Amino acid sequence: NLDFIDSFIPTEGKYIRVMDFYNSEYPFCIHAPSAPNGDIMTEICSRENNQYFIFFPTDDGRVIIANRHNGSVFTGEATSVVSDIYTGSPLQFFREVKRTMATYYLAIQNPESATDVRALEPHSHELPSRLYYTNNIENNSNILISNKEQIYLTLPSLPENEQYPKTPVLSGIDDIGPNQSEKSIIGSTLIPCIMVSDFISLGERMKTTPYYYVKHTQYWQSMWSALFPPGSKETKTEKSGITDTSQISMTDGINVSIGADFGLRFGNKTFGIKGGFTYDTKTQITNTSQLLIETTYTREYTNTENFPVRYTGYVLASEFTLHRSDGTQVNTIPWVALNDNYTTIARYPHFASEPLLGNTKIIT
Amino acid sequence: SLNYNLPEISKKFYNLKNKYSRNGYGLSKTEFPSSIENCPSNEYSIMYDNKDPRFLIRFLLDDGRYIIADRDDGEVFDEAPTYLDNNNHPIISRHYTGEERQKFEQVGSGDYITGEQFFQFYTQNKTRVLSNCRALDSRTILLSTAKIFPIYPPASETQLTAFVNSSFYAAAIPQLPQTSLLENIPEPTSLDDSGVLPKDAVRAVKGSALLPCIIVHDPNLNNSDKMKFNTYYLLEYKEYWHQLWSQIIPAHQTVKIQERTGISEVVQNSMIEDLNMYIGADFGMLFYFRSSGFKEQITRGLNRPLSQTTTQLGERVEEMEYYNSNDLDVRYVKYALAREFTLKRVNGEIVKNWVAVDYRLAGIQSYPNAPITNPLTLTKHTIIRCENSYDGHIFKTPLIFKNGEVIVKTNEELIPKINQ
């Protein structure tokens, strides 16, 4: 398996773990409450999903610590750590600092005053205890954690990225061309199951599909086709943007929206993974606070040739689909964005000229 | 792929013009002073004129903000702490330092539907905005003001802050190399075959990143040529099998062999000097102030993770004892996985190389090979010299190094025990 030599020592988000504190006298393991809310305890070790956790990484290296029983995450409260539903709160992002090769501590950063970093620590090694905070970090082995168990995950396969789609070719003057070209795969990104919405319960997601993935494709979408008489000018309708229904479905699905500049906007849940999301899908983060809307244009096209020419207009389409680990598509509403600033005109005969663009109007 | 996913504005030196100017005024490097009364200029001021335009690139930071750099002198924009009239700060030219006063946020506004949109520049978390000093069609300076006015009605004062893209020069961007697979551990051909030396080992490409020249320390070029012809540097990540030792082990004998892995301190300081980067004890990437603003984009391109330790990787000297169980003399060679980083210019010239030898992934080959000979056995392990206790563990002996297989240290029993 020399092709995957970099997977022999995997990153923190590629396996389920069982944690314990280093200087514990009895076999105590970190235990999450069975209820969606409650305190985190160090209970006696057993084979129960309350003691199995997954560290979902974020852009800056921090992790979201979710349990395999119900999917709730570590939430830093007043004096102890509780297990609450993930909402993107800053109290739910922790940092693993490896003191040695096999020991590490978990640090929480106070949203107010970034110089106040505290490590998780129990107040007993002989009895069950909650997880408290401490500012004594240097040469303090009471905060050190060891992975008692490590079970590797079988992540879903991601399709290979294909090159950008080319404009369809017309075979004759009566050929209107295909409605859509081939959907080229641009990128795919892994998204934690706690950041999406689905009819499957979070507890079952953590067991059968702890990672979803978004696929990004591009293709050419047909808008109009006509046989232009020589010297004739026609007005054709072209659509651009994204429908309000698609904008809301994508926003409720993966907590991402499309801005007016065709950049992506991330909500409270996915803000911490926008770097890896955009890099994997080859997208950009929006720079405007305006959202992309649906707009209808009419453009004047003139055939400046001595002979009749068949023309077909295409607009670049950008599509996102949400998939589970078994490959099934989640969203039943298409997440498609049309950009009228990227158009190609299939023509016959092929050696003919491009139609002259006249004036453009906007239909309300 | 590979695709670093740079924005368009991070690949072009754009000429920035005011949207509402009627005579073609924009950001300029003219040498003539400002023509406005309460808008004093100096050598460092960012000028605003309709002649001698500037061409500026925007280096994308991890947080989404940008570093605005000039194509000719290679310097960047800077919000000086000096105060002007009405409590305003001038925008000056200055060498890159990575301070907050050199980071700028771009906010798009206007009618995207009609193509009439523009963008502004904000500082200090949307509390100040870059503005022309009083004039729209006159030679003046650029500053930042806390007088932010509404955007939905482009007020007169807001018009002094609207920028658009015009002409551009393409930035010098090297092509990313395609990845390749790592070969198997080389097998010796005879008793005299001493194995494959590092200077001859076949390398596999595993990653690459585009580095802004502002964080690259290249002595052979000046800041002007380094901005135009080497706007981005190429940083490749390669892997190869680094030979640790090669030796004939006699029959039924135990020999003591030294194994040297890790990375030297002079090599670490070299990479810190040129790139403000170095390797951690967990073989992850660590960064310093000048380069920490881009550390997330760099690691995603390199496919090397951010380090989760503050311990610097150092020299590791270990003494091993192996036993040859065959009744003949066998040539034994051991290789460890090397992690190689190479900084190259746009034309492809290599600036420097930095190699760290990962002792956690090692294997052995031999002649004669299986099934003629039996696998070598590790019978003793002692750590001789190491300046940190990040990994002070030894292999639980005995341990058999089968021919070809890679011994992953984290998957073996160690002393003291781990994963407990």
Swiss-Prot record, chain A:
Post-translational modification: Processed by proteases extracted from C.pipiens larval gut; 6 amino acids are removed from the N-terminus while it is estimated about 20 residues are removed from the C-terminus to yield the 40 kDa toxin form that is seen in insects. The 40 kDa form is 50-fold more lethal against tissue culture cells than the precursor form. Larval gut extracts of Aedes aegypti and Anopheles gambiae also generate the same 40 kDa form all of which are toxic in C.pipiens.
InterPro entries reported for this sequence: Ricin_B-like_lectins, Toxin_P42
Residue pairs linked by disulfide bridges in the UniProt entry: C29-C45
Domain of life: Bacteria
Record propeptide residues: 1-4
Region annotation Pore-forming domain: where it falls in the sequence: 154-364
Region (Beta-trefoil domain): 1-153
Cellular localization per UniProt: Spore, Perispore
Main location: other
Keywords per UniProt: Disulfide bond, Sporulation, Toxin, Virulence
Gene Ontology terms, MF aspect: toxin activity
UniProt function note: Component of a binary toxin active against Culex and some Aedes mosquito larvae; about 1000-fold more toxic against C.quinquefasciatus than A.aegypti. This subunit alone is active against C.quinquefasciatus, Anopheles gambiae, A.stephensi and Aedes aegypti mosquito cell lines; non Culex mosquitoes are less sensitive to the toxin. Binary toxin internalization into host gut cells requires both proteins.
Subunit structure: Forms a heterodimer with BinB. Upon toxin crystal solubilization with NaOH at pH 12, only the 63-kDa (binB) and 43-kDa (binA) proteins were detected.
Protein name, entry field: Binary larvicide subunit BinA
Native organism taxonomy: Bacteria, Bacillati, Bacillota, Bacilli, Bacillales
Curated annotation (Swiss-Prot), chain B:
Disulfide bonding pattern of the chain: C39-C133
Region described as Beta-trefoil domain: 1-170
UniProt-listed GO biological process terms: sporulation resulting in formation of a cellular spore
Chain intervals for the UniProt region annotation (Probable pore-forming domain): 171-420
A Gene Ontology molecular function term of the record: toxin activity
Keywords: Disulfide bond, Sporulation, Toxin, Virulence
Post-translational modification: Processed by proteases extracted from C.pipiens larval gut; unlike its partner BinA, it does not form a stable digestion product.
Keyword DNA damage: no
UniProt-annotated location(s): Spore, Perispore
Main location per the UniProt record: other
Additional note from the record: In protein gels runs as a 63 kDa protein.
Domain notes: Has an N-terminal beta-trefoil domain and a C-terminal pore-forming domain. The trefoil domain has barrel and cap subdomains; the cap has 3 possible carbohydrate-binding modules while the barrel is involved in host cell receptor binding. At neutral pH the carbohydrate-binding modules are accessible on the toxin surface but the barrel subdomain is not. The crystal is very stable at neutral pH, upon ingestion by larvae the crystals dissolve in the alkaline midgut.
Family: Belongs to the toxin_10 family.
Subunit relationships: Forms a heterodimer with BinA. Upon toxin crystal solubilization with NaOH at pH 12, only the 63-kDa (binB) and 43-kDa (binA) proteins were detected. Interacts with mosquito protein Cpm1 which acts as its host receptor.
Entry protein name: Binary larvicide subunit BinB
